[PDB]
Amino acid sequence: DYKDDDDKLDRADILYNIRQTSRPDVIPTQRDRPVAVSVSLKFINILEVNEITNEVDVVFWQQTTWSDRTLAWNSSHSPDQVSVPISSLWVPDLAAYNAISKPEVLTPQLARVVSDGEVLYMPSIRQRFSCDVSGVDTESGATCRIKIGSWTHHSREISVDPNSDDSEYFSQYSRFEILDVTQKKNSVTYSCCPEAYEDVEVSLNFRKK
Amino acid sequence: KDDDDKLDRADILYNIRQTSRPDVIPTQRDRPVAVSVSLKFINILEVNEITNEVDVVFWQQTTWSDRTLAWNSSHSPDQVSVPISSLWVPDLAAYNAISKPEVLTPQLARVVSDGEVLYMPSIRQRFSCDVSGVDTESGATCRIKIGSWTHHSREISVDPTTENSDDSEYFSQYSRFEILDVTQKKNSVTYSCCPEAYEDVEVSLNFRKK
Amino acid sequence: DYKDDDDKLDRADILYNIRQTSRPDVIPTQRDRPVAVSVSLKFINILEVNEITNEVDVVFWQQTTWSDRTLAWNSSHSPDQVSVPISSLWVPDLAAYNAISKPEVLTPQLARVVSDGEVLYMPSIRQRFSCDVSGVDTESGATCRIKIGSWTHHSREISVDPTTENSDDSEYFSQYSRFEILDVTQKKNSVTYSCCPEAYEDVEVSLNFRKKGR
Amino acid sequence: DDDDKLDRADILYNIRQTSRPDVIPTQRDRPVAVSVSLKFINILEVNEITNEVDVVFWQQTTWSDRTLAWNSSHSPDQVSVPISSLWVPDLAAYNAISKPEVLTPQLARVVSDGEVLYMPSIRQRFSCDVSGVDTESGATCRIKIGSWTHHSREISVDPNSDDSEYFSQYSRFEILDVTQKKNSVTYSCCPEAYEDVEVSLNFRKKGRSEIL
Amino acid sequence: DDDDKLDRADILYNIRQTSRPDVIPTQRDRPVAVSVSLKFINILEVNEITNEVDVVFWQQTTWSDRTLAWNSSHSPDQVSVPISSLWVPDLAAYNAISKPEVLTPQLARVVSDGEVLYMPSIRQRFSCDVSGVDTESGATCRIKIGSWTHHSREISVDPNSDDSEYFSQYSRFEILDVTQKKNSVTYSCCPEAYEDVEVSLNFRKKGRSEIL
Ligand SMILES: C(=C1/CCCN=C1c1cccnc1)/c1cccs1
Ligand SMILES: C(=C1/CCCN=C1c1cccnc1)/c1cccs1
Ligand SMILES: C(=C1/CCCN=C1c1cccnc1)/c1cccs1
Ligand SMILES: C(=C1/CCCN=C1c1cccnc1)/c1cccs1
Ligand SMILES: C(=C1/CCCN=C1c1cccnc1)/c1cccs1
C-alpha cells in the first residue's frame, strides 16, 4: 500500500526476503510453462546513420518485464515495490542478433520488483547495429530492424512477447525523426540445435529531417 | 580539535558501516528521500551543432540526509570520508545522456555528524541537447534532466540545491566556450501509460563560442 | 525429457550438481586422453577493412563444444539441458594467434550443459585481426586466415578440431554489410616452434571475402 | 636479510593486520603530510585548438603511517604491498578531463620506519593553457592537485627542476622547467581550506622554426 | 600421466596451498631471477614525427619457485594455473605510453621442478626512436623492461634473432634484428639500482621504393 512505501525497515525486509528466495541463475518457470518475457524498445535517439556501411548508432530504453511469483509477498501493510540490484535477480539473457558493438548501459543497474512477483528492468542502452539504412533521405524513410531474443534459452524455456512513433520518448534534437515503431514475434530454428528460439523483430521506420 | 583522532575516525566508520544499508533508500518517517543536486560546470570540451551533441565536465553536487548515521561529535570528528560502496547513494541518471558518466575523482563521500551526506564526483559526459545558436551572441541553451532512474516521486524527490549562483564559478578559463546563464529547476516527468511521476532537476545551460 | 524442461526445482538441482562437480580450473581429461574441443566460426559481419595496415574487424559466433562426462545426469525425468554461467565451468583457454585486440564478447556469458555431459559455449565476438586484405576490392576477393587454439595446453592435453559443418559459416552474415563472404574453410592445423617439443593443435579459418560491387 | 622470504611474508601479514585502508593515518593529532612530485616522462599530444594536453608522468607520492613500522634489525627493511591493502591519499587533479590511467603495477613500498611510497606511471589529459608552445619561452600548463575530500586539518599535500633525468629524449617536446608550489584554497561558503600543489609545466615544441 | 585429471586437480590444490602470490619467491636470500624475452608478432603503427610505435609481442616470462615443485614420477609434469593464484613479477616498460593490453587467457604454466612460465600476448604503445624507419638500415626502437617496485637485490631481470618464427607476414614492416641486453638503472636521488632488460627492436618499412 502507498502509505507504507517509505517504511525503510519494511523495504529492508523485502530486500532480505527477495535475496532469500531469488535464484539468479535459474529460469523462473512456473507450472511447466516458458518464462513469458515482454520487451519494448523506447527509442530515445538516433545518433549516427551510415548509408555506406548500413550501420546505425542508437539509444533506447529497453523495457523488460517478466514474473517470478516466488518473489511475491503480501503488501497489504508494506511497500508494493522496491528497487533491487539486478545482480540479486534472474534476468533474461537477451541479445540483439544484429548488434555490432557491446551494449553500453547508461543507467544504474537496478530493477523493480513488485509484490505480485512482477519484475521490471529498463536500462538505457547505447548500441550500434547493422540494418537497412536505405531510404533514410526520402519521405517514406528507412526501416531498420533490430532482432532480440534469449541467447541460450529456447522457446520451451523462454518466450518473448511484443505501433508508436515514440513521441513521448524520442529526442526532438535528433537529426532524424521516427515515423513508426512496430514489433513482431519470431520463431527461428538455427543450424546448431534442433529446438527453436523466439525473438522479437523491432522495426524502426525513420528518416532524416 | 578532535578531527585527527584516528581511533575516533575508525569508530565512526565502523558505526556507519554497522548502520548503513547501501541498497535501501533512507526514507525517514514515511516521507521520500529529499535529494538535492546541482551541476557546477567545469568545462565544455566538444560541441557539435550539426548533431546536437555536447561533451562536458561538471561537479555533480549531491546531498541528502540519513539521520540514522548521525553521531555525537562533541568530542569527536565532525566529518569523515566514506567509500560510496559503504553507503546508499541515489540512483541518479541524466535522461538525455548519450555516454556513461565518466567519474574523474575518488569515489568517496563525506558524512557529517548530523547525518548529512555529500557526494560530489567530477564527471565527464556527453549529452543530446539543443546546440543551435552556439555561435551567436545569445548562444545555445542545452538542457539536462537528472533524476532517479528507478525511484518515483513518492520514494525520492530530486530538487535543486539552494545555491545556483555558483554554477559556473569553477568553469575553466581555457575552454573555447563561455557560459552565459545556468538555471536549475524542479521538473516532474510522467508518461501517459503509467501512474509514476519522476522528480528531476532540469539544468538549462546557456553558452556560446567565445 | 523435454516435457520436464520447465521443472524449476529440477533445473536448480542440476545447477547445484554441476557446481559441486565442476572444476573450473582443471582440464576435463577423460581416460588420460586429450580434451577434444570443437570450434567453428560462423561469420556475422565485417566492420572495418584497412588496406593501409592489413587489418580487419570482424563479428562472429564462436561455436565451441566439448564434453565433461562427470557433469552428466539421468534426464529420463528431468530437463535435457540447462544454461550455466561460464564462471561455474571449465572453458577452453582459446586464443586467436593473429588477433590484435581483445575478444569483445557481445552476448551473455552463459554456456549450455547437456545431460550427456556435452557443453556448448557460443559467444558472439567482435575482434580485430592482422591478415591479408589485398584483393578485397576485386572479383576474387581477399583471404584472411584466423588461427585459433589453446593458449597454454599443448596437443597432449587439448586437441582443437574443426566441425565438418560449414554450410552455415556465412548463413547468418548480415545482408546489409558492404562486404560479402565468398568462401570459408575451417581446417585442422598444428603449430610447433623450433625451441621446444610442444605442438599446439588449432583450427585455421580461411575467410575469402570482397567489397560488393555497385 | 631482505631476501628472507618468510620474514617478508610475516611483514606483509603484520601490515595487513594493522592497516586501516579507509581511515586517514593521522598521527599525534596532526594532518597527514602527503608529499607529491610529478616526474614528467612524455608529452603525447598538445591540442592548440582545444587547450588540452595528454601526458605521462610518474606520480611520486609519499606519506608515513608509523603504525606500520617494524623492527628491522634482522629483517627486511622494505617490502612491496598491493595498494588495496593500504590507505592511499584520495588525490585528484582539478583540471583533469580524463580518468587517470595507471600504466604500472599497483604496488606501494612500505619501509620499516612506516614510510609509504606509491609511484604509479599515469597517463592523463588536462585542460590548460597551451598558448606559446611553439615559441622560445614555451607554454606553461598548470595542474592543480590535492585531496578530493579531506581538508587541510586532515591532509596537507606538499611539493624546481627541468626533469632531465626522466623526460623522454624522443618526445616532440622538451621541458624548460617544472615548478611545484604549495597552494591553499578556501571556498567562499565554508570555513575550511584545501591544501593543494600547483604544478607548472613549462614546455615547448622542438624545431619551432620551420619551412612552410 | 599428464592427463590424469585427479592428479592435476591435486597439483593445483597443492600449488594454491603453498603459493604466496604477494611475496617474492626468494631462495637462499638471493634475488629472484626473472628471464624476459619479447617475441615480436606485429608492428601496427609507427609515427616518425612523434617517435611512437604500436606493437604486439609475446612476453615470454620465466622464473622459479621451488616451493611449488612436486614429484612427477607418476604424475603430470606440468599444469596450467590462473596467474591470480601465483606470484608474478611486477614488470613494467619504462617508456610505455599506454597500458599493456593482454590479449590472451591469463594462465601460466607451472612445471614440477618449480619453473613458472607466463607468456601473455600484449599490445602496447611506446615512446622510442623511430628515426630511420624508411631507410635500409632501419630504425632501432628500444624498450626497457624491469620490475617496477623491486630493486636489484630483490629481483634480477635478465635476457639475437629476427623473430622469423613469430613476426607477421602481413605487417607493413619487417624486422632486421632483435637483441636483448642486460641493463641497470640508477637515479641520483636514491641508492638502489633497478635491473632491466633493454630490448632493441631494429626494423624498417617493408618493400619500400627507393631512389637509386
Ligand atoms: C520507466 C522510466 C521512465 C523514467 C526513467 N526511469 C524509468 C524506470 C522505471 C522503473 C525502472 N527503471 C526505469 C518507464 C516505464 C514506462 C514508461 S517510462
Ligand atoms: C547458436 C545459437 C543460435 C541462436 C542463438 N543462440 C545460440 C546458442 C546456442 C547455445 C549456446 N549459445 C548460443 C548458434 C551457433 C552457431 C550457429 S547457431
Ligand atoms: C609458447 C607458446 C606458443 C604457442 C602459444 N602459446 C604458447 C604458450 C605456452 C605456454 C604458456 N603460454 C603460452 C611458446 C614458448 C616458446 C615458443 S612458443
Ligand atoms: C566541494 C569540494 C571542493 C574541493 C574539491 N572537493 C570538494 C568536495 C567536498 C566534499 C566532497 N566531495 C568533494 C565543494 C562544495 C562546495 C563548494 S566546493
Ligand atoms: C622510483 C622508481 C624508478 C622507476 C622504477 N620504479 C620506481 C619505483 C620505486 C618504488 C615504487 N614505485 C616505483 C623512483 C623514485 C624516485 C626516483 S625513481
Coordinates of C-alpha atoms in Angstrom, one line a residue, chain A residues 14-187:
Chain A
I14 CA 11.6 -7.1 1.4
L15 CA 15.1 -7.0 0.0
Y16 CA 16.1 -9.6 2.6
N17 CA 13.2 -11.8 1.5
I18 CA 14.0 -11.4 -2.2
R19 CA 17.6 -12.3 -1.6
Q20 CA 16.4 -15.4 0.4
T21 CA 14.2 -16.7 -2.4
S22 CA 15.9 -15.4 -5.5
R23 CA 17.7 -17.9 -7.8
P24 CA 19.6 -15.5 -10.1
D25 CA 20.9 -18.3 -12.4
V26 CA 17.7 -20.4 -12.8
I27 CA 14.9 -19.5 -15.1
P28 CA 11.7 -18.7 -13.1
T29 CA 9.5 -21.2 -14.9
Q30 CA 6.1 -21.7 -13.3
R31 CA 3.6 -24.5 -13.9
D32 CA 5.8 -26.2 -16.5
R33 CA 5.5 -23.3 -18.9
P34 CA 8.1 -21.0 -20.5
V35 CA 9.0 -17.7 -18.9
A36 CA 7.0 -15.1 -20.7
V37 CA 9.3 -12.1 -21.3
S38 CA 8.0 -8.9 -22.8
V39 CA 10.4 -6.4 -24.4
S40 CA 9.5 -2.9 -25.6
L41 CA 12.2 -0.6 -27.0
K42 CA 11.5 3.0 -26.5
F43 CA 13.8 4.9 -28.8
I44 CA 15.4 8.0 -27.4
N45 CA 17.9 8.9 -30.1
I46 CA 19.3 8.1 -33.5
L47 CA 22.9 9.5 -33.3
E48 CA 24.8 8.3 -36.4
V49 CA 23.5 6.7 -39.6
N50 CA 25.9 5.5 -42.2
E51 CA 24.3 4.8 -45.6
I52 CA 27.5 3.4 -47.0
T53 CA 28.0 0.8 -44.3
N54 CA 24.3 0.3 -43.3
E55 CA 25.0 1.0 -39.7
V56 CA 23.2 2.9 -37.0
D57 CA 24.1 4.2 -33.6
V58 CA 21.1 4.4 -31.3
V59 CA 19.9 5.0 -27.8
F60 CA 16.8 3.2 -26.5
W61 CA 15.1 2.4 -23.2
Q62 CA 14.8 -1.4 -23.1
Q63 CA 11.6 -2.0 -21.1
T64 CA 11.9 -5.7 -20.0
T65 CA 9.2 -7.4 -17.9
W66 CA 8.5 -10.9 -16.6
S67 CA 7.3 -12.5 -13.5
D68 CA 8.8 -14.7 -10.7
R69 CA 5.9 -15.4 -8.4
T70 CA 8.3 -17.0 -5.9
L71 CA 9.4 -13.4 -5.1
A72 CA 5.9 -12.2 -4.2
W73 CA 4.8 -11.0 -0.8
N74 CA 1.7 -9.7 1.0
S75 CA 2.0 -5.9 0.7
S76 CA -1.3 -5.1 2.5
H77 CA 0.8 -3.3 5.1
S78 CA 4.2 -2.9 3.3
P79 CA 5.7 -1.4 0.2
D80 CA 4.3 -2.7 -3.1
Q81 CA 7.6 -2.4 -4.9
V82 CA 11.3 -2.0 -4.2
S83 CA 14.4 -1.4 -6.3
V84 CA 16.8 -4.3 -6.5
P85 CA 20.3 -4.7 -7.9
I86 CA 20.0 -6.9 -10.9
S87 CA 22.9 -9.0 -9.6
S88 CA 20.5 -10.3 -6.9
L89 CA 17.9 -11.3 -9.6
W90 CA 17.5 -13.6 -12.5
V91 CA 17.3 -11.5 -15.7
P92 CA 16.5 -12.8 -19.2
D93 CA 19.7 -13.4 -21.2
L94 CA 18.7 -11.2 -24.1
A95 CA 20.9 -10.4 -27.0
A96 CA 20.5 -8.3 -30.2
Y97 CA 21.4 -10.5 -33.1
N98 CA 22.4 -7.7 -35.4
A99 CA 24.3 -5.7 -32.7
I100 CA 27.9 -4.8 -33.8
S101 CA 29.1 -3.2 -30.6
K102 CA 28.7 -4.2 -26.9
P103 CA 25.6 -2.7 -25.3
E104 CA 26.6 0.4 -23.3
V105 CA 24.3 0.6 -20.3
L106 CA 23.9 4.2 -19.4
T107 CA 21.8 3.9 -16.2
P108 CA 22.0 2.4 -12.7
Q109 CA 21.6 -1.4 -12.9
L110 CA 18.6 -1.7 -10.7
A111 CA 15.3 -3.5 -11.4
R112 CA 11.9 -3.0 -9.8
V113 CA 10.3 -6.0 -8.1
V114 CA 6.5 -5.7 -7.5
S115 CA 4.8 -7.6 -4.6
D116 CA 2.9 -9.8 -7.1
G117 CA 6.2 -11.1 -8.4
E118 CA 6.4 -8.8 -11.5
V119 CA 9.9 -7.7 -12.4
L120 CA 10.7 -4.6 -14.4
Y121 CA 14.2 -3.9 -15.7
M122 CA 14.7 -1.0 -18.1
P123 CA 18.3 0.0 -18.9
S124 CA 19.1 2.9 -21.2
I125 CA 21.3 1.3 -23.8
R126 CA 23.6 2.8 -26.5
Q127 CA 24.5 0.3 -29.2
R128 CA 25.4 0.1 -32.9
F129 CA 23.6 -2.2 -35.3
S130 CA 23.8 -3.5 -38.9
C131 CA 20.5 -2.8 -40.6
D132 CA 18.9 -1.4 -43.7
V133 CA 19.5 2.4 -43.8
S134 CA 18.4 2.7 -47.4
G135 CA 15.8 5.3 -47.9
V136 CA 16.7 7.4 -44.9
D137 CA 16.9 10.5 -47.0
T138 CA 13.4 10.0 -48.5
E139 CA 9.9 10.8 -47.3
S140 CA 8.9 7.2 -46.6
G141 CA 12.2 6.8 -44.8
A142 CA 14.4 3.8 -43.9
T143 CA 13.3 0.7 -42.0
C144 CA 15.9 -0.7 -39.6
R145 CA 15.1 -4.0 -37.9
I146 CA 16.6 -5.0 -34.6
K147 CA 16.2 -8.6 -33.7
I148 CA 16.2 -9.5 -29.9
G149 CA 15.7 -12.7 -28.0
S150 CA 17.2 -15.1 -25.4
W151 CA 20.7 -16.1 -26.3
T152 CA 20.7 -19.6 -24.7
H153 CA 17.0 -20.4 -23.8
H154 CA 14.8 -22.0 -26.5
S155 CA 11.1 -21.4 -26.8
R156 CA 10.1 -24.1 -24.4
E157 CA 12.1 -22.2 -21.7
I158 CA 11.6 -18.5 -22.6
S159 CA 9.0 -16.9 -24.9
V160 CA 9.3 -13.3 -26.0
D161 CA 6.1 -11.2 -26.5
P162 CA 5.7 -7.9 -28.3
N163 CA 2.6 0.8 -33.1
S164 CA 4.0 4.1 -31.7
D165 CA 6.2 6.9 -33.0
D166 CA 7.8 7.1 -29.6
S167 CA 6.8 10.8 -29.3
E168 CA 6.9 10.7 -25.5
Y169 CA 10.5 9.4 -25.6
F170 CA 12.4 10.3 -28.8
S171 CA 14.7 13.4 -28.7
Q172 CA 13.4 16.5 -30.5
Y173 CA 17.1 17.4 -31.2
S174 CA 17.9 14.3 -33.3
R175 CA 18.7 15.0 -36.9
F176 CA 16.2 12.2 -37.5
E177 CA 12.6 11.6 -36.8
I178 CA 10.6 8.5 -36.2
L179 CA 7.7 7.6 -38.4
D180 CA 6.8 4.3 -36.9
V181 CA 8.0 1.6 -34.4
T182 CA 6.4 -1.9 -34.7
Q183 CA 7.3 -5.3 -33.2
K184 CA 6.7 -8.7 -34.5
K185 CA 7.2 -12.1 -32.8
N186 CA 9.6 -14.5 -34.5
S187 CA 10.3 -18.2 -34.1

